[PDB]
Curated annotation (Swiss-Prot), chains F, G, I, J:
InterPro entries: ATPase_proteolipid_c-like_dom (IPR002379), ATPase_proteolipid_csu (IPR000245), ATPase_proteolipid_su_C_euk (IPR011555), F/V-ATP_Csub_sf (IPR035921). The record marks E134 as: Essential for proton translocation. Residues 26-47, 110-121 are cytoplasmic. It comes from Arabidopsis thaliana (Mouse-ear cress). This is V-type proton ATPase subunit c1. It is found in: Vacuole membrane. The gene is VHA-c1. GO terms for cellular component: proton-transporting V-type ATPase, V0 domain; vacuolar membrane; vacuole. V-ATPase is a heteromultimeric enzyme composed of a peripheral catalytic V1 complex (components A to H) attached to an integral membrane V0 proton pore complex (components: a, c, c'', d and e). The proteolipid components c and c'' are present as a hexameric ring that forms the proton-conducting pore.
Length: 153, 268, 168, 294, 152, 155, 155, 153, 155, 155, 156
C-alpha cells in the first residue's frame, strides 16, 4: 500500500543526495580554481575539467533516480512493501555513496589545484588520486544497480 | 581531529616541508623566507596575527617623523607590510589588532612614545596587546608557547626596569603598567632589583629556576632580552612540533631565529 | 501495549533492506573519508617532492580496500535476500532473518567506517613522515597494514552473522 | 568499641549471656509476632543478637542518631556555659548578662524539647513515638493537636517553649547595643548566630553518619573474610583471603577511616565548641630562648 | 521474536569495540610518525603500543563470535532471557573496549613523545600502558561470564 | 518475566561505566606521568601509584558485575520484577560511582604528576588525594553490594 | 508492583549523584592542592582540609542511600506506589543536594588552595566559607531523612 | 492515587533547586571573598556577608520542603490530584525562585567583592543590592507557601 | 477535572518567569553599579534606581501570580478546563512579559551606570529609558489582570 | 468544546511575543542612546525618538490581546474548535510580527544612535528605517485584526 | 472540520515569515545606511532603495496573508479537507519565499550600501543586483497566489 510512497521517497533521496554531493564538490573545486587562477592563469583550464568532473556524479545520480522511477508502476504489478522498501534502500545507498564520493573528490580537487601549480609533474598523480576516488562512485553505482535489479518482485 | 583532513592539510604539509628544508646573505635569506610565507596565501587569522607580531614593531618604527623615509629600506613583507603624529596614527589604527588599543593607551603620541625610553614603552604596550589578542584565539597547544613568550618579554622588561630603567620612572608599578605564571604572578618581579633578587624571583617557578643561572649572559641585556634569551635557549621545545597542530607560528619563529643566527655569523 | 504492539508489528523486510543498504553506504563513506585524508598528505608531499608517489599510492590502495570489502559484503547481503512471501511476512523465521540482516549490516558499516578513519589518519601521518625521511616508510606502512585489519575483522563478523538468514 | 559491643567487625561475649532470646521459636522463624523476648539488658554493650540480625540497620541507626543528638546538645551546652566563665575570668562588661544569657538560653531551650522527648521515649518506652513520631511531634508549629504527645504537659510545654524561643530573639540583639549607647559591631553577631545555631545542631549528625559508614565498611570486610574462610577454606585460598583482608584493613579500616574521623572531629570541634569561645586574634609570645638553636 | 535484541548485541559488541580500537590506534599511530621523523630506531620499537591497541579489536572480535554462535534459533528455543542476556553481554564488552582503547590512544600518544625525549622512561610508559590495557581484558572476562548465563 | 531484560542491563551498565571511569582516570594519569618523567626519570616509578589506584576501580567494577551476574538465576527462584529492578539499580549506582571516582582520580593524579617533580612532598600529597578519592569508590562498591544483597528477597 | 523499581532507582540515584558531586569536589581540591604545594610544604597537610570536607558529603550520601535501602521491606509490608514515589523523591533530593554541595565545595577549595600562597590570615575565612557551603549537605541529609521517615506511613 | 507521585517530586525538586541556586551563588561569593582576603585580609571577615546570606536561600528551601512533606497526609484525607498537583506546582515555583535568586546573589557578590576591595565605601550599596536580590527569594517563598496553603478541595 | 493542574502550572510558571527576569535584571544592574561604586561613590547612591525598578517588576509579577492563585476556589465554583486554560495562559503571558522587561531593564541599567559615570547629564535619559521599559511590564500586568478576570466567565 | 485551550493561549502568546520583541528593541536602543549621551549629552534628549517609536509594539500587542480576550465569551455564544483556532492563529501572527518589528527597530536604532552622533546631517534622514519598521508592525497588526474579525463566522 | 485550524495557521505563518524576512532585510539595510553615513551624507537619500525593497516585501506578504484570510468563509462552501491543507501549504510557501527574499535583499543591500562610497556610480549596478534578488519575492507571491485557490476551491 505504502510501498509506492517508500519507493518514490527512495528515488527522491537518491537524486537529492547525489545532487548535494556533486554541488559541494563542484563548489570546492571552483573555489580552488578561482584561487589558482591569479597565480598561473595559463593553468586555469589545465584543471578546470577535473573541477567540473562533479557532473559525472550528478549524471550518475540522475540515472539512478530515473531507473528508480521506471521500476514503479501499478499496472505491471501490485508491488508490496518488499519492493518499495528495497527500492528505497537501493536509492538511499546510491545517493549516500554519490554524496561521499562527491565530497572526497571535491577535497582532492581542492588539493590538486594548488598541487599542480606548485609542481606540473604532479598532474598525473592528481589524476590517479581522482581515479581512485571515482572508483568508489563506480562501486556505488554497481551496488545500486544490483540492488535495484532484485526489487522487481 | 578530522577537521585537519577536512581543510588545511595541504597547507600544513607544505609548511612542514618548508620548515624541514630550512636550516646581504642574511637579507637574502629573510627575503626568501618572507616570499615563502607570502606564497602560502581559519589559519588566515593565525597568519594575520603572526604577521602583526612584527608589524607592531614595524609600525612603531614608522611612527617616527626625523628620517622617516628610511623605513622603506627595511620593508620586509614578513613584518614591514604596508597594511600593518596622532593624525597619521589614527589612519594607521586600522588593519592591526593592537592599533585600536594603542590609540587610547598611547593617545599622547610622541609624548608617550619618546625615542629614548617611552617609545620602547609604547612598543611594549603594543606587544602586550598583540600577545593578548593571540592568546584570545585559544584552542590549540600554541597557547602555552604564546604564554611563555609573553612571560619572557614581561620578565625581561621588568629586569631591565629594575636594573637601570627604575631611574627612568619604570618603577615596580610600571613593571606591569608600561612594561607589557606571569599573567597571574608577575608581582614577584616588582622587587627583584638585584641579580640575586632576579634569581630568587625566578625560583618561584621551578621551570624558570636555574634558567637565570649566573645571569652573566642573557639577563645582562636591557629592553626585552633578559628572559627572552631564556626562551631562545629553550626554543628546542618549539623544535618538537607535534603533528596535526598549528605549527605555522613555530615555523615562522624558527625561520626568524635562523635569520638572526645567520646575521650573528656575519664575518665569522 | 498498543504502541508496543505496533512497534512489534513493523515489517522486518524493510529493516533488513535498510541495514543492507546502510552497510554499503557507511563503508563507502568511510572509504571516501580515509581516501581524502590520505590524499591531502599525498598531495602535500608531492608538492614538496614527487619522488615518493609510489610509496604514497599504498595508502590510497589500502583505503580503497575498505570500499572493496564493503561492496563484497553488500553483494553477499543482496544474495541473502528472499521473495518475502505474504503468508510468512510476520513469521518468526522472517523476523529473525531481518533482525540478523540489520545487525550484520550495521556491524559491517560501523567497522568499515572505523577502519577507514584509522587508515586515513595513519596514512596522513605516514606521508608526512616519509617526506621527513624515506627510511621510516617501511615501519609506517607496516603500522597502516596492521591497522587495516579492523575492516577485515568487521567483514569476517558480518559474514559470520550472514549465515543466520533463513527467510522462507 | 567496647561500648559498641563490636570487636574487629565481629561481636563477642558481653558481660551478660544473651540480652534477647527468641520468644519460643524452637523451630519458628525469627520474623514473627513473638519475635525475641529479652530476659534482661546486657550492661557492657549492645545486644549481641541485634548486631547480626536483619533488624540491625534500623535499631542501630536510631540509637546512633539519638546518641549524636544528645552528644551535640551536651557539647553545645558546654560551649555556651564556657562563655560565662570566660566573661568572669576576663572581667567582661554586662554584655555577658546582656547577651550570653539569652544566647545560651535560646538554643538550649529550642533543643530541650527534642532532647527531653528523646529521653522520655527512651525512658518511658513510648513506642507510639519511635524515631519518626518524635520529629512528627516536633514538626507541628501550631497549637492544639498533641494526640501522640507523651509528656503529660507537652500540650502547654510546647507552647511555652515556642513563646520563650520567640521572645529570646530580640533579647540576644538589643541589650549589647543598648549598653554600648549608654556607655557612649553587633551586626556581625546579628543574623549569623541564628543560622549558625541550626547549622551546628545539624552538623552533629556527621558523627552518626561516620559511625554508620565505618560499621558498614567493617561489616563488608568481615563478610568478605568469612566468605573466603568458609567456602574457600583451601590453604592457598584461605591464605590469599587473609592477605586481602589484612590489606583492606590497613587501607580503609586503618588509614582512610581514621583520617576521615579525625578530620570530622576537628571540624566539629572548631565549628561548634570553638564558636562559643576562643574568639581568635592574639599571637604566640616567644622570647629569644635559643629557639633556632634549640 | 525477542531474538532481535540478542542479534543486535553481537553487532553492537563488535561495532563499539572497533570504534574505540580505531581511535586508540589513530592516536598511537600519529605519535609514532612524529617520533619517526627524527628518532629512527626508537620508532620501530615504539610500535608495540600500537600493536597493543590493535589487540583490543581481536578481543572484541572473539566476543562477537561467541555471541553469534549462541544465537542458533533452530537448535534451542531462544527465549527473551537469552536475547536479553546476549545483548547485555555485548553491551559491556563493546563499551569497555571503547573506553580501554581510548585510554591506550591517549597514553600511547604521549608515550611516543616521552620515549623520543628520554629513552630511559620507555619501561615506565610500557608498564602504565600494560596496566591500562588490562581493562579490556577485564571487560572480556565480564563478557564471558554474562554470556555464560544463557542456560535458561 | 521481563525482569532479566532490566537486571542484566544494569549489570552490564555497572561494568561499562566502571571501565569508562577507569579509562578516563588512566589517560590523565599516563599523560601526567609522561610529562613528569620527561624531565625527571627518577620519579617516574613513584609517579605510577595513581595509575594503579585508578585501575583498582576496574577490579571493583568487575567484582560488582560478577556479584550481579551471580545474583540472577531463574532455575533457582522466580526472579520477579522487584529483584531485577533492584539489581539494575545496584548496577547503575555502582557504575556511576565508579565512573565519577575514576574521573576525579585521573584529574587529581594528572595534576599531582605534573607537580610531582617540583617538590618531593607531592609523593605524599598525591597519594593522600588518591586514597581519599578511592574512598568514594569503596563506598560506592559497598552500597552496590548492599543493594544487590537486598535484591535477593523479593517477598 | 512497579513501586519497588522506583524506590531502588531513587536510592541508586541518590548514591550515584552524591558520589559524582563528591568526586567533582575532590578533583577540584586535588588540582588546587597539587598547584599550591609545589611552592611550599604548607599545602601538603595544613590545607588538606577540603580533601576530607568533600568526602564528608559522599559519606552522608552513602548513609542516606543505606537508610533508603533499609526502608524497603516487602516481606514486612506490601509497599504501594506511595512508598516508591516517596523513596524516589528522597533519593533525588539527596543526590541533587550532594552534587550541588560537591561542586560548590570543589570550587571554593580550589580557590582556597590557590590563595594559600597568599597571606595566611585568610585560612580562617576559607574554612568558614567551606563550612557554610557544606551546610547544604547537612540540609539535604535532613530533608532526605524527613522524607524517608514520612515514606513508610502509606495507607 | 497518583497525587503523591507528584507532590513528593515537587517537594524534592523545590529542595534540589534551592540547593542548586544557593551553591551557584556561594561559589562566586567564595571566589570573590578569597580574592579580597588575599588582597586585603583586614576585611575578609566582614566580606562574608553575601556568603552568609546565600545560606538563607537554602534554609528557605528546606522550610518549604518540610511544609510540603507535612502537606501530604493520606491518613488525614484521601489525597486527590487537586492537592498533589498544587503542592508540586508550589514546590516547582519555590525552587525556580530560589535558583534565580541564588544566581543573582552570586553575580552581585562577585561584583561587590571587587567593589569593596577597590573601595570599602560601597559596602552599603553592596548590602542594598543584596537585600533587593533576596527580596525576590522572599517573594518566591511567600508565593510557594500561599500556593501550598490551598490543598483543601 | 484536571483544570487545577493547568491553573497551578500557569501560576508557577508566572512566578518562576518573573523571578528569573527580575534576577537577570538585578544581576545586570549590580554588574553595572560595581564600577560606579568606586569611580564616583557620591553618584553611586543615586545609581540604585534600576535595582528598584527590577524589584518593582518582580513584585508586580508576584502580585499577578497571587491574584491568579486566589482565583482558584474549587469549593465555591467548579473549575472547568476552560477557566484553567485561561488562567494558565494569563500566568504564562505575565511571566514572559515580566522576564523580557526585566532583561531589558537590566541591560539598560548596566549601560546607564557607565553612561552616568562618564557624564552626570545622562541621568535624565537613563530615567526615561527605565520608565519606558517599565511601561512594558505595566502593560503585561494589565493584560494578565484582564485575562484573570475573564477566566471566570465559563459555565 | 476545548476552544480556550488554544484561543486564550494564543491571546496570551501574542502579548508575550510583542513584549519580548519590544523589550529587546528597547534594550538595544537604550544601550545605543546611553553610549551616544556619554559621547555627547546634547543629543541624548533628541535621540529618544527611536526609543519612543519602539514603544508602539507594546501598545499594538496590548490592543490585540484585549481584542482577543473580548473575542472569547462562552456566555454570549459557544465557540467551536475553529472559533478558537482562528483567534490563536491571529494572536500568533500578531506576536511574531511584533517581535520581528521590535528586533528590526532595535538594530536600526542601535545603528542610528552612532550615525546621528557622527553626522547630524543624516540624523533626521535615518528616521526612514524606523518609519518602515513601524509600517511593518502596523501591517502585521492589521493582518492580525483581519484574522481575528472572523470570530463570529463559525456556525 | 479541523482543516480551518490548519488553514488559519498557514495564513498566520505566511504573515509571520514574511514579516521576519522583511525585518531581517531591513536590519542589514539600516546597518549599511548608517555605515555609509558621515562618510558620504549626500548619498543618504539614494541609499533608501533597500528600505523601499523591504517595505515592498512586507506589503507583498501582507497582501498574500489578506488574500488567504479572504477565503475564511465557513458560512458557505464547507471547508472539507482541501480548504485547510491547501491554505496551509500556500501560506508556508509564501512565508518561506518571503523570508529567503528578505535575507537575500538584506545581504545585497548591506553590501551595496557599504560599497556605495567606492565607485559611487555603481549605484545602478547595485540596484540591478538588488532587483534581481528581489524578483524571488515576486515569484514567491505569484506561487502563493497560484496555490491560494488551485487546491482550495476544487475540493468537490
Amino acid at each position: 500500500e505504502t510501498a509506492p510512497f517508500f519507493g518514490f521517497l527512495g528515488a527522491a533521496a537518491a537524486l537529492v543526495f547525489s545532487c548535494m554531493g556533486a554541488a559541494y564538490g563542484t563548489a570546492k573545486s571552483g573555489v580552488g580554481v578561482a584561487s589558482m587562477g591569479v597565480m598561473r592563469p595559463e593553468l586555469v583550464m589545465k584543471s578546470i575539467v577535473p573541477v567540473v568532473m562533479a557532473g559525472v556524479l550528478g549524471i550518475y545520480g540522475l540515472i539512478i533516480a530515473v531507473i528508480i522511477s521506471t521500476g514503479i508502476n501499478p499496472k505491471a504489478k501490485s508491488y508490496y512493501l518488499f519492493d518499495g522498501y528495497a527500492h528505497l534502500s537501493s536509492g538511499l545507498a546510491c545517493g549516500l555513496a554519490g554524496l561521499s564520493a562527491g565530497m572526497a573528490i571535491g577535497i582532492v580537487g581542492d588539493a590538486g589545484v594548488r598541487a599542480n601549480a606548485q609542481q606540473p609533474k604532479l598532474f598525473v598523480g592528481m589524476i590517479l588520486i581522482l581515479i581512485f576516488a571515482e572508483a568508489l562512485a563506480l562501486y556505488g553505482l554497481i551496488v545500486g544497480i544490483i540492488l535495484s535489479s532484485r526489487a522487481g518482485q | 581531529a578530522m577537521t585537519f583532513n577536512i581543510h588545511g592539510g595541504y597547507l600544513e604539509a607544505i609548511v612542514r616541508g618548508y620548515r624541514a628544508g630550512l636550516l646581504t646573505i642574511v637579507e637574502k635569506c629573510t627575503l626568501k623566507l618572507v616570499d615563502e610565507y607570502k606564497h602560502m596565501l581559519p589559519l588566515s587569522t593565525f597568519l594575520e596575527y603572526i604577521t602583526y607580531g612584527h608589524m607592531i614593531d614595524n609600525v612603531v618604527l614608522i611612527v617616527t617623523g626625523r628620517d622617516v623615509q628610511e623605513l622603506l629600506e627595511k620593508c620586509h613583507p614578513l613584518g614591514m607590510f604596508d597594511s600593518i603624529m596622532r593624525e597619521l596614527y589614527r589612519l594607521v589604527l586600522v588593519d592591526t589588532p593592537l592599533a585600536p588599543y594603542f590609540s587610547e593607551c598611547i593617545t599622547s603620541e610622541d609624548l608617550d612614545d619618546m625615542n629614548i625610553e617611552i617609545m620602547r614603552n609604547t612598543l611594549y604596550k603594543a606587544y602586550l596587546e598583540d600577545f593578548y589578542k593571540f592568546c584570545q584565539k585559544l584552542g590549540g597547544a600554541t597557547a602555552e608557547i604564546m604564554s611563555d613568550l609573553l612571560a619572557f618579554e614581561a620578565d625581561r622588561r621588568a629586569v631591565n626596569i629594575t636594573i637601570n630603567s627604575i631611574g627612568t620612572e619604570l618603577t615596580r608599578d610600571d613593571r606591569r603598567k608600561l612594561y607589557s605564571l606571569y599573567p597571574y604572578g608577575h608581582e614577584e618581579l616588582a622587587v627583584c632589583e638585584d641579580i640575586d633578587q632576579v634569581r630568587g624571583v625566578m625560583e618561584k617557578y621551578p621551570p624558570y629556576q636555574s634558567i637565570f643561572s649566573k645571569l652573566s649572559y642573557g639577563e645582562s641585556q636591557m629592553l626585552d632580552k633578559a628572559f627572552y634569551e631564556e626562551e631562545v635557549k629553550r626554543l628546542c621545545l618549539a623544535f618538537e612540533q607535534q603533528f596535526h597542530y598549528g605549527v605555522f607560528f613555530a615555523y615562522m619563529r624558527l625561520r626568524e631565529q635562523e635569520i638572526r643566527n645567520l646575521m650573528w655569523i656575519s664575518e665569522c | 501495549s498498543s504502541w508496543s504492539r505496533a512497534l512489534v508489528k513493523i515489517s522486518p523486510y524493510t529493516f533488513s533492506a535498510i541495514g543492507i543498504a546502510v552497510a554499503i553506504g557507511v563503508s563507502v563513506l568511510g572509504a571516501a573519508w580515509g581516501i581524502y585524508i590520505t590524499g591531502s598528505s599525498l598531495i602535500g608531499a608531492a608538492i614538496k617532492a614527487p619522488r615518493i608517489t609510489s610509496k604514497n599510492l599504498i595508502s590510497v590502495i589500502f583505503c580503497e580496500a575498505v570500499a572493496i570489502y564493503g561492496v563484497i559484503v553488500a553483494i553477499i547481503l543482496q544474495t541473502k535476500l528472499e521473495s518475502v512471501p505474504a503468508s510468512q511476512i510476520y513469521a518468526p523465521e522472517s523476523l529473525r532473518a531481518g533482525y540478523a540482516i540489520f545487525a550484520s549490516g550495521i556491524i559491517v558499516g560501523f567497522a568499515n567506517l572505523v577502519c577507514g578513519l584509522c587508515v586515513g589518519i595513519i596514512g596522513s601521518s605516514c606521508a608526512l613522515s616519509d617526506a621527513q625521511n624515506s627510511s621510516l616508510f617501511v615501519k609506517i606502512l607496516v603500522i597502516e597494514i596492521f591497522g587495516s585489519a579492523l575492516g577485515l575483522f568487521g567483514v569476517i563478523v558480518g559474514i559470520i552473522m550472514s549465515a543466520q538468514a533463513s527467510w522462507p | 568499641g567496647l561500648i559498641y559491643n563490636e570487636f574487629f567487625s565481629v561481636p563477642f561475649e558481653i558481660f551478660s549471656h544473651s540480652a534477647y532470646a527468641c520468644r519460643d521459636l524452637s523451630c519458628s522463624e525469627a520474623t514473627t509476632v513473638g519475635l525475641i523476648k529479652v530476659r534482661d539488658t546486657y550492661p557492657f554493650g549492645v545486644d549481641p543478637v541485634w548486631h547480626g540480625s536483619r533488624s540491625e540497620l534500623p535499631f542501630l541507626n536510631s540509637l546512633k542518631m539519638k546518641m549524636s543528638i544528645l552528644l551535640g546538645v551536651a557539647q553545645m551546652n558546654l560551649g555556651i556555659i564556657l562563655s560565662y566563665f570566660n566573661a568572669t575570668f576576663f572581667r567582661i562588661g554586662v554584655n555577658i548578662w546582656c547577651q550570653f544569657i539569652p544566647q545560651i538560653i535560646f538554643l538550649n531551650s529550642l533543643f530541650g524539647y527534642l532532647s527531653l522527648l528523646i529521653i522520655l521515649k527512651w525512658i518511658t518506652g513510648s513506642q507510639a513515638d519511635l524515631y519518626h513520631v518524635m520529629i512528627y511531634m516536633f514538626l507541628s508549629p501550631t497549637d492544639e493537636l498533641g494526640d501522640n504527645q507523651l509528656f503529660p504537659g507537652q500540650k502547654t510545654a510546647q507552647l511555652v517553649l515556642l513563646l520563650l524561643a520567640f521572645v529570646s530573639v530580640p533579647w540576644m540583639l538589643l541589650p549589647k547595643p543598648f549598653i554600648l549607647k549608654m556607655q557612649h559591631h553587633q551586626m556581625i553577631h546579628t543574623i549569623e548566630f541564628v543560622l549558625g545555631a541550626v547549622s551546628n545542631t545539624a552538623s552533629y549528625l556527621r558523627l552518626w553518619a561516620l559511625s554508620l559508614a565505618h560499621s558498614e565498611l567493617s561489616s563488608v570486610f568481615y563478610e568478605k573474610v568469612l566468605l573466603l574462610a568458609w567456602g574457600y577454606n583451601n590453604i592457598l585460598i584461605l591464605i590469599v583471603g587473609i592477605i586481602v583482608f589484612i590489606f583492606a584493613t590497613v587501607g580503609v579500616l586503618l588509614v582512610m577511616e581514621t583520617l576521615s574521623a579525625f578530620l570530622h572531629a576537628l571540624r566539629l570541634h572548631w565549628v561548634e565548641f570553638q564558636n562559643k569561645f576562643y574568639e581568635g586574634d592574639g599571637y604566640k609570645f616567644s622570647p629569644f630562648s635559643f629557639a633556632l638553636l634549640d
